[PDB]
Every structure is written in C-alpha cells, then in structure tokens.
Amino acid sequence: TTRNDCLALDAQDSLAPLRQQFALPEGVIYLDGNSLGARPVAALARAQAVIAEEWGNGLIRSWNSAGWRDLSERLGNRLATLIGARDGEVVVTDTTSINLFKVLSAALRVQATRSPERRVIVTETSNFPTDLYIAEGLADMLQQGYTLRLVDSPEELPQAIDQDTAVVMLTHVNYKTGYMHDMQALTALSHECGALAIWDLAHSAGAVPVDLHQAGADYAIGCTYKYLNGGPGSQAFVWVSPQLCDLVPQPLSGWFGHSRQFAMEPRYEPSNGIARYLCGTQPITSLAMVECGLDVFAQTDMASLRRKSLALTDLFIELVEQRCAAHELTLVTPREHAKRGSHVSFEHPEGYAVIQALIDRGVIGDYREPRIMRFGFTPLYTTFTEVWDAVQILGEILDRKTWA
Amino acid sequence: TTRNDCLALDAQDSLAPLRQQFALPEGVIYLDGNSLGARPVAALARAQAVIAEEWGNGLIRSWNSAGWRDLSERLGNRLATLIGARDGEVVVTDTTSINLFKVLSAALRVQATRSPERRVIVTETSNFPTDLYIAEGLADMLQQGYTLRLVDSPEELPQAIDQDTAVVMLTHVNYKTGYMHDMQALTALSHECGALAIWDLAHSAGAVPVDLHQAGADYAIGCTYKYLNGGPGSQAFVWVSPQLCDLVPQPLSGWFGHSRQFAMEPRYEPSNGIARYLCGTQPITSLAMVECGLDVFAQTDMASLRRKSLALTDLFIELVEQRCAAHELTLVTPREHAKRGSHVSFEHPEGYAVIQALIDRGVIGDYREPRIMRFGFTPLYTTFTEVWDAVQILGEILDRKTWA
Ligand SMILES: *Cc1c(COP(=O)(O)O)cnc(C)c1O
Ligand SMILES: *Cc1c(COP(=O)(O)O)cnc(C)c1O
Ligand SMILES: [Cl-]
Ligand SMILES: [Cl-]
C-alpha cells in the first residue's frame, strides 16, 4: 500500500462529507475517539442556547418550554436506532457505572425469585475495571453468597457458565484487546444455562452493528462520550428488554422514575417501562449535547460505518507491518473481523514511551497496562490518508528511538 | 411599609453589586431560585471554553491539560467554605438521589457492625419525595427488616428516635413549608439515641448558615442547582465526617473512587477520604459551570446573605398581609426566624391558579401540593423593590380574580 492508494481511498469514500460536521484541531491525527469522541460543530451553538436562552431567560419554565422534562427519553429513542432497540426502551441518564448497578440489581432480584441458589456473576478478568468494581460493590453490600468468577480468556467462558450462574456480565468489545464477543451466541448460551445476560456496549454502540432484540439480550448499558461523540463525561444509556423491565423495580428509585400518571405521594410507584430507570435531575447542558453526536449517525448507518471501520483497521495493521516490521511490535487485536471491534492494540516493551512520543507529534492514541498501545478508528471523521501519515510518524519515532 | 421604603432598602443594600454578576431576563421577578438558580454571567464563557477549547481542541489530553481529573474535588473544596467543611471532605458528583444512596448505605453498614438489630430509618412524611423513594429502594433491596418511620410533624421527631433507630435522615429545610430544623440539636439527640444523622442540605447550602463540624453531623448531601446557581441539573455534592469516611466503602464503587496511588487491578481499592464517594465519569460541561455559581459566594459570606434573606422574607410576609389581607391566604412558613429558611409559602384554595396567573405576569414562584404557593428569596440577586412590585401584582390578580 502507498500514500497515493490512501488518497484514492479518501476520494472514493462516500462518508467523507461527514468529517466536515466535526471541529477537529489542526495538525492532530486523533486516534482516541474510542475514549473521548471528537466534537460535532453543532455542540457549541446547542450549549449556547441551553445556557443563554433556556437557563438564562426561561429559568424554571424551561422544564416545559425547552423540552427538558423528556430529554432523557427522546435521546434514548434516537440512540435506540443504532442498537436494535425500539421507542420507549432506552433512556440516557447518569453514568455507565451507575446504570450497571441499576440493571445488575434488577437482574439478581429477578433471579432471586426465578432461581434462588444461583449466586455467581460470570465475567472476564480483563473487563473494564469499573464494571468489576461495581459488581464487587453490589455483591459486598447484599450478602450473600454472591461472588464474582473472573475468567482469563474468551474461550474459557462456556465452562464458567453453568447452573450456578445468576448473571453473565460482559463488555461486548474488550477495552484493551479490541476482541469482540458474539453477542447472540453468548446470550443464547447464557439463557440455555439459566443465566440472564448483561452487555456493556461502551466500545460497541456507534462502533459496530448491535441488535439487542435479535441477540435476545436482557439488559444493556453503555457510554455516549466515546464513539457517540456526546461530549466530555456525557451521560450514559440503559436499555432493558420489555420482557423483564416491569417485573421488578431497580434500587436507585429516584423521583424522575416515578409514574407520571399519579401524584408524588410518600410511596414510590415506578413508571411503566424504561422510565423507571431514571433517577434524579440530570445535568442538562451536558445531556443536550448528546443530541449533536447522535444527529451525525442519522445521515448514514452502522453497516456503512462498520465497512469503513474495518477498512481503516485493516489499513493500520497492514501499514504498521509494512513500515515498522523491523521493530518489536506485537499485534494483540484479532486479525479475524468477526472478533474485531473498531480499535487496534499493539504491545511494545516501551509502549508508554512510544505513545507519549506519538502524542508529542500530534498522533493521539492511548496507553493501557501492561505495554499496550491502543488506537481507535472512528470512520465518521478519520481519513485513510491520516492513517498513512500516523504510521509514517510512528516509523520515524521507532527508527530514531525518539521515545527515549 | 411603602414602595419608597423598599427603594431606600435597596440603596442601603451592600450586596447590591452582586446582582450585576447574574444575567436576568428583563421584566421577570424571579422567585424560584430555590428550585433553579438564576444564571451567573460567567457561565456562558466558561462553557464556551470547555466546549470549544478543552473538548474541541484538547480532546482526551484535557483530562490533564484542562484540570478535569480533579474538578469534583476542587469544586468540593470551594463549596466546603459555605457549610463548615474542610479541604478534602466534599466532592461534587452525581445527583442528590444517588449521593443519598451512597451515604445511607455507608451509614447502615457502619451500624450493622456497631449496633446490629437497629433497623429503623426515621424521617418525615413531608420530606422531599426522592429522599423517601431512595430510602425505600435501598431498604427494599437489602432485606431486612429495614423499615421507614414517617413522622407527620417536626415536634413528633424526638419520640420516634429511640434504641431501634439506625439512622435519622432529614432534609434540613422543608421543601414545602420552609421550616428549618436545628441541625445541632437533632444531631446531638440522634447520637444520644445511638443513631447516625444524615442531612439533606438542598434548601440549606447557599441559603442559610451551615456548619457540619460544629453540628456533629455524620453525612450530608445537597444540590448545586438551587441556591448555589450551578446551572440546570448541575451535579450534587456529598460530605462525610472524617470520623466515618474510611470505616466502610460505599456501594457505588466506580473507578473514579479507586485509590490514585495504585494501579487499577481487578480488585477495587477505595481512595482514602472523600474521593471514595466518586464513582464514574462526570458530565464535564455541566460540572464546570458549578464553579461560576460558587465564585459569587466568595465575594460575601453566609451571615450577610442570611441577614438579607430574612429581611426579604420578613418584607414579603408583611407586604402580603398589608396588601392582600382581604383574600384567603394562609401563611404556612414559620414566623420565628430560627425555624425559617429562605422561602415563604402561603396556602390558598386556588393556589395553583394564582401561581400560574403570577407566572403569566412574570412573577415566578411555584406550586406545591396541596394548595401551596411557594416563593424563594435569593439575596444575591433579589431586590427589596421587586418584592414590593411582586406583591402589587399578586394584589391586582386577587382583587380582579384574574386566576379565574
Ligand atoms: C432539589 C432536591 C432534590 C433533588 O434530587 P436530584 O436527585 O438532584 O433530582 C433532592 N432532595 C431534596 C430535599 C431537594 O430539595
Ligand atoms: C468507558 C467505559 C466505562 C465508563 O464508565 P463511567 O461510569 O461512565 O465512567 C465503563 N465500562 C466500560 C466497559 C467502558 O468502556
Ligand atoms: Cl476506554
Ligand atoms: Cl424543590
């Protein structure tokens, strides 16, 4: 592959116009949109309106006159289009850690009636730390004998899922390796074994095709600030299968989840449907900007984005081997597309130092322990040519030992 | 009292210059800053910088290069100055409902070791609904025999607090009546009885003098979007007495509360101190604007604000009686200052209709069930003359039966 081949790929790229809907800083090749999505141009004006007009002038009236009262649900309805969910099934609220607590609590309470004695939550050792920590906090508070089974690889999951399994809790795309689980198959296997399946979509929603209904998933959660480009710390989302949602309340039972059809008397009464997963007053300025990120996706579809994403990661892996073969890089992301998300990770003995030398030259990925260099490929605003230019900078750094 | 007396009060008002630090809409007399605080002028430019510069240009780098990593703690440190807390004791994160869940869980777990068999959480029937609902959700998830004792008036609290009381959970200023508890005395009595004391400061922080250390309080939570003027749905805060903080973990154990001195391995390890009450990634744009509200308070103190607040509520009550005596208004807020917060509530048979007729004329309070008309007085940006003008509009409405 040559630079000219990459320039041609960009010329043929039907998604090219969508890049213009983002305000990217000059000179930067941003390969960390899997950790903080780049900014849609419209986010600035949207926030200016929330602040100056809705808050500043409307004040408390804006709960009605600016639509704030149903923002979590309208945003959920938009996001649903990207994950095989329907209207009235998704809300955007709180954070991924919090939402996981809500659905894991709901799942264990469903299984306490259905199948008591089931006490194990199966997951992976390399799961995103907060998912582990939240599951550990919940189990520690409940007692007992709720315990966590950490499995050291994806292939060991089937033997760890058995009659003792209350819940299988997995992040669909591994935050370190970029390995992608087969959602439908691991869900079917969880159900076969009697367990409910909870999927963290942080590295999936807006990155790869997801269809929660088709997969038979029970609960899901994820972030809007990564591939969905919602802004820094923008609120997470939660989806619950209509089969399960109204069976039990979730424990973070704040007033926004109270039924809207009856007055707020001393006794909590949950809303029918997903609105029961609402809790408290949401940071509105940050919440409103989620819309700007979602709006860009409306101009294409996840099949088209998946296609460009695979072309970008294929190109990155190929170019790194082509240009940097004579250095000590080890691919940790699967070569096989069905097991691949939208990022690529290489290990390197001085991976931290190389990542910082790259950042020092405007090529921004990130470092994960141990020794992993992670690069996210975001087809909405990443070009093929900038992949070439990024690898050339990496090659220059490695050849010159700039990292030292 | 006359309008000219009010004009003179404004001329003598040493706090008058602080009003100019808020961008208020023309023609509005805003008496709902106890529900959504008015906008500091600086909030717009602050958000513009977060969006355009920190997010848009800095991207993921801003976790370091814009201070995002310690924002919750720096904001907590600022807020601490207003509630008798010290550095390293307060964080601004999540919402009041969520934070209450964190501290109530911590309190019950402390009491499960200290004094098992204690199973009652005492509170009031007229407590803000979400506080009740969160306590109900937690008790319902734990089991058992955790139960809630709802007390129908402030004077009935002493007899409800006994040897069975794990926790006394109270909102310091009643959201409906504006009645203010004696924090120090009810805390002392809770401790005398063996209970821990949790105080919701939603209608207290930034409104009345608070000193959590002097009061001997165990845990506290509150909002930044009311009297602290942080913006719509701006994040809540939580304080924990240093005596208790490190005794147990709180159950919403997300990664931001992990110790910063050690790597993020599979096992959660809480930070020493208040940082353990952090959980997940916070909505940064909304969080940053909390600073603008806190900054105004730095230019005065809570004694001075308390003084002007009492002068405003005294004036409102007096003017309403002076001008509206011949109508069916019933004062529900205590006349006695030591039992009074910073708002005034009147009951009226058609209270809802009167509140909307007032809103229709730009005088904005709110309606609480049943039949309560609530008006918040915010000395940072409320003038004495606008109190006069508001009452004159109320008088015109009542005389003409405009509410019909
Ligand atoms: C305003 C208020 C709340 C708000 O709760 P959120 O979870 O922030 O919506 C809670 N409790 C009390 C007493 C309040 O006054
Ligand atoms: C990004 C990410 C999170 C973030 O959690 P917050 O509570 O939003 O900070 C959680 N889990 C996974 C798998 C992630 O990729
Ligand atoms: Cl990540
Ligand atoms: Cl309120």
XYZ file of C-alpha atoms in Angstrom, chain A residues 23-25 28 30 32 35-40 43-44 47-48 50-52 55-61 63 68 94-95 97-98 101-102 105 109 125 128-130 132-134 136-138 140-143 150 175 225 229-235 249-256 258 263-269 279-287 289 359 362 364-365 369, chain B residues 23-25 28 30 32 35-40 43-44 47-48 50-52 55-61 63 68 94-95 97-98 101-102 105 109 125 128-130 132-134 136-138 140-143 150 175 225 229-235 249-256 258 263-269 279-287 289 359 362 364-365 369:
182
model
C -14.480 20.664 14.517
C -11.064 18.986 14.642
C -7.865 20.766 15.758
C -3.714 16.421 15.020
C -6.840 11.821 16.545
C -8.591 8.266 20.642
C -12.083 7.203 24.728
C -13.319 10.748 24.064
C -15.198 11.380 20.845
C -14.304 14.486 18.836
C -16.633 17.483 18.870
C -19.560 17.950 16.462
C -22.401 21.209 20.058
C -21.174 24.755 20.719
C -24.897 24.563 24.539
C -25.004 28.341 23.989
C -29.210 25.874 26.656
C -27.208 28.342 28.743
C -28.174 31.760 27.407
C -31.500 28.524 31.588
C -30.745 32.224 31.498
C -34.089 33.509 30.179
C -36.571 30.647 30.562
C -35.260 29.639 34.018
C -37.514 27.043 35.750
C -40.104 27.487 32.989
C -38.717 22.246 32.198
C -36.051 19.309 29.414
C -26.337 9.006 34.817
C -23.080 7.108 34.068
C -21.116 2.572 36.405
C -24.420 3.746 37.892
C -25.623 -1.047 39.241
C -29.288 -0.475 38.316
C -29.571 -5.254 40.836
C -33.687 -9.724 42.043
C -10.507 -10.609 34.279
C -13.080 -2.599 32.169
C -12.202 -2.016 35.865
C -15.318 -0.020 36.826
C -15.750 -5.244 38.012
C -15.712 -2.694 40.842
C -19.468 -2.019 40.593
C -17.982 -6.138 43.594
C -19.618 -3.249 45.451
C -23.129 -4.600 44.891
C -20.420 -6.818 49.020
C -23.488 -4.789 50.103
C -26.075 -7.551 49.546
C -24.669 -10.719 51.173
C -13.193 -13.835 36.697
C -11.446 -2.211 26.046
C -18.940 10.093 25.194
C -19.460 11.895 20.425
C -21.695 13.347 23.157
C -19.034 15.481 24.880
C -16.821 15.073 27.963
C -18.481 12.808 30.524
C -21.776 12.964 28.647
C -24.443 10.759 30.204
C -38.101 -2.103 40.395
C -34.448 -1.068 40.242
C -32.970 0.155 43.560
C -31.870 3.680 42.556
C -35.549 4.657 42.641
C -35.388 8.438 42.316
C -38.307 10.739 41.527
C -37.776 11.066 37.754
C -41.946 7.822 39.434
C -49.110 12.368 42.224
C -45.881 12.061 44.219
C -47.136 10.643 47.498
C -44.830 9.131 50.174
C -44.810 5.706 48.443
C -42.655 5.246 45.307
C -44.578 3.959 42.289
C -33.447 8.562 38.993
C -32.562 12.205 39.627
C -32.213 15.551 37.872
C -29.739 15.235 35.020
C -27.030 17.759 34.104
C -28.919 19.400 31.239
C -26.185 21.287 29.405
C -24.103 18.109 29.017
C -27.182 15.991 28.295
C -25.119 17.912 23.573
C 1.186 12.336 21.392
C 0.042 15.093 17.445
C -3.125 10.632 19.811
C -3.889 7.088 20.904
C -1.336 -1.586 31.084
C -27.844 37.674 33.645
C -31.539 38.039 34.493
C -34.303 38.307 31.859
C -39.231 38.991 35.310
C -37.806 35.570 39.729
C -37.908 30.391 42.105
C -35.702 25.392 42.511
C -33.462 26.583 39.666
C -30.885 29.236 40.450
C -30.506 32.132 38.011
C -27.518 32.244 35.673
C -24.157 33.822 36.565
C -21.318 30.553 32.977
C -21.662 31.168 29.233
C -18.954 26.577 28.957
C -17.740 28.022 25.637
C -14.954 23.794 27.930
C -16.597 23.015 24.592
C -14.513 24.870 22.020
C -13.061 19.274 24.384
C -12.771 20.500 20.823
C -9.013 21.164 20.699
C -7.508 19.419 23.730
C -9.695 16.298 23.334
C -8.600 13.427 25.653
C -5.494 15.418 26.609
C -8.041 15.188 31.455
C -10.790 17.738 34.526
C -23.762 12.677 40.508
C -27.193 13.757 41.863
C -30.715 10.952 44.966
C -27.578 8.990 44.064
C -27.985 6.195 48.338
C -24.192 6.225 48.817
C -25.694 2.591 52.532
C -23.238 -0.765 57.124
C -43.813 12.397 55.789
C -38.837 15.713 49.507
C -40.240 12.659 47.642
C -36.958 11.444 46.102
C -38.174 8.897 50.675
C -38.090 6.925 47.416
C -34.317 6.329 47.607
C -37.407 2.885 50.210
C -35.461 1.459 47.269
C -32.397 0.701 49.392
C -36.358 -2.981 49.636
C -33.137 -4.288 48.017
C -31.321 -5.161 51.268
C -33.812 -7.106 53.431
C -42.614 8.613 58.567
C -39.069 21.940 50.728
C -28.555 23.870 41.031
C -26.644 28.624 40.942
C -24.689 25.858 39.183
C -26.970 25.507 36.139
C -29.776 23.127 35.122
C -29.317 19.728 36.759
C -25.796 20.635 37.848
C -24.174 17.917 39.940
C -16.719 1.533 51.422
C -19.860 2.910 49.786
C -21.584 0.530 47.325
C -21.486 2.654 44.144
C -17.772 1.844 43.935
C -16.853 3.152 40.489
C -13.330 3.694 39.170
C -13.001 7.427 39.935
C -10.261 3.930 43.251
C -2.842 0.586 39.570
C -6.363 -0.488 38.598
C -6.203 -4.231 39.144
C -9.309 -6.490 39.263
C -9.899 -5.747 42.982
C -11.436 -2.376 43.960
C -9.368 -0.409 46.474
C -17.996 6.790 41.024
C -17.987 7.363 37.265
C -17.079 9.939 34.632
C -18.936 13.169 35.325
C -20.639 15.384 32.729
C -17.854 17.963 32.467
C -19.571 20.876 30.743
C -22.304 20.981 33.408
C -19.820 20.294 36.209
C -20.324 25.723 35.485
C -46.198 33.331 36.159
C -43.606 37.398 35.049
C -42.272 33.220 39.086
C -42.710 31.098 42.191
C -49.435 20.105 46.586
